[PDB]
């Protein structure tokens, strides 16, 4: 009798108790006089989000209509100011609405001017009221010696960009690679910095242990990488001693070319045919939850369409990572495709016949034959579709000259529509394309090194381009 009464008392005490987390005035339906529409509350549907899900339909026919309308948004980065600065080695990662950016700032001439600054800056990609996804660089790092920090590479993970670079007291450690130490630095930079952070805003991660395997030196090499959970995948390159590069010479596609040799694609895996080291691409694994001081594991890329380790870019587009590798040797067609497996790295390289990079005399653009060359430029492509497998990036439309940067949109066998970003004789060298979503529109921000012929300096010019929807 009284026990069932007490059970009713306890059940009332358990159910009608409102122990709840605090209300959120924006989530709940709010009804103020003369209101604004409530339409949808979803995070990362308000600002800039990655290419994920199902974006708006891009124009898919090949057309002669100028429909890509690029917007020079270069003022959003410290590439402007005094024109006595030559601005070298840019970098542009973009995850989830946050960017990273890094250049070397030399005073005077591009070749021997005094190195002012290596600004390593992260920030936020957003629409800054000008109806164009601009950049807003807040947290900026600059090392105590900008002549030793080379080949940075950036990955965003939980309110930080992590930027991995090479510490080289012997110059560009591709070029003086036999005397490089292999030492690397990891700079962790908050994308929304706290006032008075101290360890939150800018932190230096000490990498005292690298997992290479059969490689003697590894190095981050390329703009941007990915995160997969708690694991960072810096695009990279392995320095393999050429005498240990086991490679059966009959594998070389010497047929359909009367002038190649069975030595060529073995030889042109290094920067010069008697290179002591062979540049094989890959990734660097940085799993954050390995512990205190997580080690860096090199992942060698698989030998399908193997060429020399050129600057690489693994980028997360529409759910599955896409790897890009520049063509710094004879395989001058563009070498990129969806990542089948990340460790071990196996890329389904797209059979791409139409997009190539210019190189100098030995291996020009539209060259397939195995020649010995270390030639070509990082002209990047970003994946903006998978049902039709469309991509976009800025490519230098000339056979042998580093000129005419053209933002173009292409299949594996067809270019759909272009937009030349400058004049035809505008010397441009390294373009970095990242695309994202802004109100479910595919906007692509395309950094492009441009050499100003007047000021005799190299200067990155950003081009926030909206991938159009009709024609």
């Amino acid at each position: 009798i009284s026990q069932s009464t007490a059970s009713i008392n306890e059940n009332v005490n358990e159910k009608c108790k409102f122990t709840l987390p605090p209300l959120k005035i924006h989530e709940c339906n709010i009804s103020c006089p003369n209101p604004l529409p409530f339409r949808e509350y979803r995070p990362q549907t308000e600002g800039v989000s990655n290419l994920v899900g199902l974006p708006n339909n891009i124009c898919l026919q090949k057309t002669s209509n100028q429909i890509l309308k690029p917007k020079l948004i270069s003022y959003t980065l410290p590439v402007v100011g005094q024109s006595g600065t030559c601005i070298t080695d840019p970098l542009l990662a973009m995850d989830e609405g946050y960017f990273a950016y890094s250049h070397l700032e030399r005073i005077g001439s591009c070749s021997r001017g005094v190195s002012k600054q290596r600004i390593i800056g992260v920030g936020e990609v957003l629409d800054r009221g000008d109806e164009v996804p601009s950049l807003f660089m807040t947290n900026v790092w600059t090392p105590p010696n900008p002549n030793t920090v080379y080949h940075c590479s950036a990955v965003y993970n939980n309110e930080f960009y992590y930027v991995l670079c090479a510490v080289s007291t012997v110059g560009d450690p591709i070029l003086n690679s036999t005397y490089w130490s292999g030492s690397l630095m990891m700079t962790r930079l908050a994308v929304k910095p706290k006032s008075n952070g101290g360890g939150y805003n800018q932190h230096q991660l000490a990498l005292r242990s690298i997992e290479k395997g059969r490689y003697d030196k590894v190095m981050p090499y390329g703009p941007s990488g990915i995160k997969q959970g708690d694991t960072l995948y810096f695009p990279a390159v392995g320095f393999l001693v050429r005498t240990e590069f086991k490679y059966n010479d009959s594998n070389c596609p010497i047929t359909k070319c009367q002038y190649s040799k069975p030595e060529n694609c073995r030889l042109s895996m290094g920067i010069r045919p008697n290179s002591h080291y062979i540049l094989r691409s890959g990734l660097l694994k940085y799993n954050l939850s390995d512990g205190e001081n997580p080690k860096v594991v090199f992942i060698e890329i698989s030998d399908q369409r193997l060429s020399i380790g050129s600057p690489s870019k693994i980028y997360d587009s529409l759910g599955q990572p896409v790897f890009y590798q520049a063509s710094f040797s004879w395989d001058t067609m563009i070498k990129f495709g969806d990542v089948l497996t990340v460790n071990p790295l196996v890329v389904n390289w797209r059979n791409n016949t139409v997009i190539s990079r210019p190189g100098q005399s030995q291996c020009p653009r539209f060259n397939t034959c195995p020649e010995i060359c270390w030639e070509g430029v990082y002209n990047d492509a970003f994946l903006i579709d998978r049902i039709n497998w469309i991509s976009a990036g800025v490519f230098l439309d000339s056979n042998q000259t580093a000129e005419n940067p053209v933002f173009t949109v292409f299949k594996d066998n067809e270019i759909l529509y272009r937009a030349q970003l400058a004049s035809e004789d505008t010397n441009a060298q390294k373009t970095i394309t990242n695309c994202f979503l802004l109100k479910n529109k595919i906007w692509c921000i395309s950094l492009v090194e441009i050499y100003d012929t007047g000021d005799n300096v190299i200067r990155p010019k950003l081009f926030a381009v909206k991938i159009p929807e009709q024609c």
Partner: antibody, heavy 131, light 111 residues
């Protein structure tokens, strides 16, 4: 036509200072680097310092670092050289000359080519560091 | 500094061929191109070769340049009396951030 003219050389007591000038004709020194090359009687050419074309970069040779100071006046179109703490090994003929650098952008991982030379040399006046 | 070496003095008959070598490190000659300067004594130095093989406007063809590895060359064929001077190879060191002139080749033509 295109020519550099020195002035302000001459006899100076050791440890002192002498400011050399470089009257520029035919061009503007704001657009190009400029450099000082000396030659002691009995030796070859030795580079001394360099001012940047537009920008504020001052290079110095390792034996003259902290003693010589290069600057220029764009309005006067004249490269200067403030030489200070003159050792007797600065007894030479100082030649102002521009360093015209030619850079093309090449589709290569090295990026740009940059062959690099001095073409327009001044007459060169004598710094005599003695009693 | 990196003192780029030359033959100090080579000599040949008029009309003959002489090649003036210029050897230094890899940081200055191997990375950066080299330039050549003849210098009659008592006279301003004169630009002869730049980009290892090209000439400024107003030089006869008998001054030939070369660069091989960390070494360079200045070939002078058909010697005349006014080609007797000191010959200076000059280049920029990307390490020292400096011009690097050669030690000087007192070419002794006859004439």
């Amino acid at each position: 036509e295109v020519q550099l003219v020195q002035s302000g050389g001459g006899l100076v007591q050791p440890g002192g200072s002498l400011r050399l000038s470089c009257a520029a004709s035919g061009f503007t020194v704001s657009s190009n680097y400029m450099s000082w090359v000396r030659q002691a009687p009995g030796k070859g050419l030795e580079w001394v310092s360099a001012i940047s074309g537009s920008g504020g970069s001052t290079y110095y040779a390792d034996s003259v670092k902290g003693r010589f100071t290069i600057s220029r006046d764009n309005s006067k179109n004249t490269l200067y050289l403030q030489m200070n703490s003159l050792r007797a090994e600065d007894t030479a003929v100082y030649y102002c000359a521009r360093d015209r650098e030619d850079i093309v952008v090449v589709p290569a991982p090295r990026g740009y080519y940059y062959y690099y030379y001095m073409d327009v040399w001044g007459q060169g006046t004598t710094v005599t560091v003695s009693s | 500094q990196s003192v780029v070496t030359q033959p100090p003095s080579v000599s040949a008959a008029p009309g003959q061929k002489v090649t003036i070598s210029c050897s230094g490190s890899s940081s200055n000659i191997g990375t950066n191109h080299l330039s050549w300067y003849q210098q009659v004594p008592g006279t301003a130095p004169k630009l002869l070769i730049y980009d290892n093989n090209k000439r400024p406007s107003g030089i006869p063809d008998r001054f030939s340049g070369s660069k091989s590895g960390t070494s360079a060359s200045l070939a002078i064929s058909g010697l005349q009396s006014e080609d007797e001077a000191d010959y200076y190879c000059a280049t920029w060191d990307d390490s020292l951030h400096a011009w690097v002139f050669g030690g000087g080749t007192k070419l002794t033509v006859l004439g």
